[PDB]
Amino acid sequence: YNSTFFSTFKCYGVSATKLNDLCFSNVYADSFVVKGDDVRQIAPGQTGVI
């Protein structure tokens, strides 16, 4: 909350307000870089080049 801010942050399968009350089993992080018009394509059930 002091330094880093996100333009989009959307989660599926769990509400955000409960993220501090849980514990997570098999955590993986995928990283890449896209353009601005492709950020909407990183979602379930989407079409496009990405």
Ligand X SMILES: CCCCC/C=C\C/C=C\CCCCCCCC(=O)O
Note the residues at the interface with its own copies (CB under 8 A).
1, 5-9, 15-17, 19, 35, 37, 40, 45-49
* Least distance between ligand X and beta carbon 33 (Å): 17
38, 48 Cβ separation under 8 angstroms: yes
Q: How crowded is residue 35: how many other Cβ atoms within 10 Å of its Cβ?
A: 7
Residues in the site for ligand X, rule: CB under 6 A? 6, 9, 19, 24, 27, 29, 47-48
Q: Taking the CA atoms of the chain, what radius of gyration do you get in angstroms? A: 14
**Residue 29 touches which of ligand X, its own copies, none (Cβ within 5-8 Å per kind):** ligand X
